[PDB]
Amino acid sequence: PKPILYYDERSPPVRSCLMLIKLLDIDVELRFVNLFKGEQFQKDFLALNPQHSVPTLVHGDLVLTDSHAILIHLAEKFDEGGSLWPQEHAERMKVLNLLLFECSFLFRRDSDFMSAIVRQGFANVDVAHHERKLTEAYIIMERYLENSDFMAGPQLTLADLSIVTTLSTVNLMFPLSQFPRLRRWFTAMQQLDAYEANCSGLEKLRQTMESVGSFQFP
Amino acid sequence: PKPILYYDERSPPVRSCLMLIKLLDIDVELRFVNLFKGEQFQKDFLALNPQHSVPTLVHGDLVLTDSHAILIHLAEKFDEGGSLWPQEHAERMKVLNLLLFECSFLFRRDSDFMSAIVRQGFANVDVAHHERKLTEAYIIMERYLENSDFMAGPQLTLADLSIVTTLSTVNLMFPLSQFPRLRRWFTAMQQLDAYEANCSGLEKLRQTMESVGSFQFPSSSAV
Numbered sequence: 143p144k145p146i147l148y149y150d151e152r153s154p155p156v157r158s159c160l161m162l163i164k165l166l167d168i169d170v171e172l173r174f175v176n177l178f179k180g181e182q183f184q185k186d187f188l189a190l191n192p193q194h195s196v197p198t199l200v201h202g203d204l205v206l207t208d209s210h211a212i213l214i215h216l217a218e219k220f221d222e223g224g225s226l227w228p229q230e231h232a233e234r235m236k237v238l239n240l241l242l243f244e245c246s247f248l249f250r251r252d253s254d255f256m257s258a259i260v261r262q263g264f265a266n267v268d269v270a271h272h273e274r275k276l277t278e279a280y281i282i283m284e285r286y287l288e289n290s291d292f293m294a295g296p297q298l299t300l301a302d303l304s305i306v307t308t309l310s311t312v313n314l315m316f317p318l319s320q321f322p323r324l325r326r327w328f329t330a331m332q333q334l335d336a337y338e339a340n341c342s343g344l345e346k347l348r349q350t351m352e353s354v355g356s357f358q359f360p
Numbered sequence: 361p362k363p364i365l366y367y368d369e370r371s372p373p374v375r376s377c378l379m380l381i382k383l384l385d386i387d388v389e390l391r392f393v394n395l396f397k398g399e400q401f402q403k404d405f406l407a408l409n410p411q412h413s414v415p416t417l418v419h420g421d422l423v424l425t426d427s428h429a430i431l432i433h434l435a436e437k438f439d440e441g442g443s444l445w446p447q448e449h450a451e452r453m454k455v456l457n458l459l460l461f462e463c464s465f466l467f468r469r470d471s472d473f474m475s476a477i478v479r480q481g482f483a484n485v486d487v488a489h490h491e492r493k494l495t496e497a498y499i500i501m502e503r504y505l506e507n508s509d510f511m512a513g514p515q516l517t518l519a520d521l522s523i524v525t526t527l528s529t530v531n532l533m534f535p536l537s538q539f540p541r542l543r544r545w546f547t548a549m550q551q552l553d554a555y556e557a558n559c560s561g562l563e564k565l566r567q568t569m570e571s572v573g574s575f576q577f578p579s580s581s582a583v
């Protein structure tokens with residue numbers, strides 16, 4: 143049966159999966175779960191994913207509850223022989239390493255920041271604190287890009303898809319003007335056909351944040 | 361070339377790799393990085409890992425900066441065809457899925473709690489808040505173990521090694537009395553020879569945390 147993606151396109155890790163679906167032309171059935179209404183706490187979704195998180199993928203009997211597992215799974219089933227998830231071990235480990243960096247460091251810090259706005263109101267967030275945490279992520283990715291057109295090497299991989307959606311979200315608040323490699327990479331990413339799938343949810347997140355946080359992004 | 365593991369055994373994700381190294385009898389050179397003295401900010405280590413995090417593995421010219429990639433890399437190179445990182449696609453996806461649960465949810469929440477203690481002192485931490493966050497993680501893992509007999513399936517996998525080190529760290533603070541499957545599973549993990557690689561760093565974490573946080577964990581909590 144075709145895969146099913148439970149999703150809220152405001153979420154960075156959802157948008158990474160939407161970009162891969164568009165890049166690989168995967169026929170998928172989308173099911174919207176409204177996180178700001180708490181629809182992730184509906185009893186049947188919680189039964190499916192007790193982490194109450196999106197993206198969640200149901201593909202046959204397989205239930206994946208993390209965008210990085212979904213990215214890898216979809217590339218393995220639908221892009222065998224592709225370069226997005228390279229077959230050579232050392233290259234695949236480098237892509238895996240950067241996907242985990244996205245989860246563990248970039249997304250963690252952006253999520254901490256944005257959740258603080260949601261839950262405290264923008265005016266009550268220590269923006270300087272989060273600016274330092276997130277500028278440090280920028281600095282790290284700028285080094286990752288030294289002598290490398292893309293995050294994990296010379297070609298576009300799953301790591302770029304994961305990182306670009308969160309990066310574009312950080313960039314709602316903090317500009318890339320100080321990071322030339324990272325700003326050129328982001329411009330290049332924005333020229334992908336598949337980047338179209340990031341646009342709609344990023345703007346929806348911008349609008350939802352500004353409403354719930356009682357503020358406007360620079 | 362022999363793998364080099366930059367490590368602080370107090371760190372849960374370090375201990376998961378140490379468990380795999382002992383379980384597979386991998387010869388690895390250990391290089392200590394004292395997180396509580398800020399040695400992860402020495403210029404040479406930042407050059408190697410700009411996230412200034414342990415575990416960091418150097419194996420040949422491959423540099424891995426996340427425990428879950430290290431676990432997968434070491435299983436592929438030293439447990440080829442094994443069942444820790446299974447070859448069947450759906451089974452491997454389930455292990456990967458739970459490795460990411462440990463990264464995204466359990467460790468995130470345990471790290472947030474313990475970092476708050478380090479930065480604020482235990483008496484200034486909203487312990488009730490973190491108790492809610494972490495008990496929710498217990499509930500989730502109990503549900504996983506209601507469906508299977510290990511975290512990602514019927515056999516031991518990398519997911520159990522990743523999850524048990526953080527589980528044991530959470531359980532320094534919060535008891536497992538109300539969680540029978542998780543107690544049964546935890547007791548089974550404690551029977552593995554490889555669990556020795558978790559016991560020592562866990563105790564050092566307990567002692568350092570009590571010093572820095574000016575508190576004591578409830579001795580009755582730990583299983």
Ligand SMILES: CC1(C)CC(=O)C(SC[C@H](NC(=O)CC[C@H](N)C(=O)O)C(=O)NCC(=O)O)C(=O)C1
Pocket residue numbers: 152153154155177182193194195196197207208209210245252253256257260464
């Ligand atoms: C305010 C903001 C930006 C806060 C967020 O964190 C997100 S992302 C939505 C979130 N999804 C995950 O946390 C999955 C992370 C995994 N590592 C992965 O799939 O990669 C989510 O579902 N939250 C719902 C909840 O926790 O109840 C966001 O969209 C809004």
Ligand SMILES: CC1(C)CC(=O)C(SC[C@H](NC(=O)CC[C@H](N)C(=O)O)C(=O)NCC(=O)O)C(=O)C1
Pocket residue numbers: 242246370371372373395400411412413414415425426427428463470471474475478
């Ligand atoms: C107080 C406590 C428990 C806080 C912690 O978070 C840790 S773990 C040490 C930490 N390592 C990582 O964050 C790696 C996470 C990756 N997803 C992975 O490898 O799996 C670390 O190195 N911190 C140093 C720093 O950030 O400066 C801990 O040990 C202490």
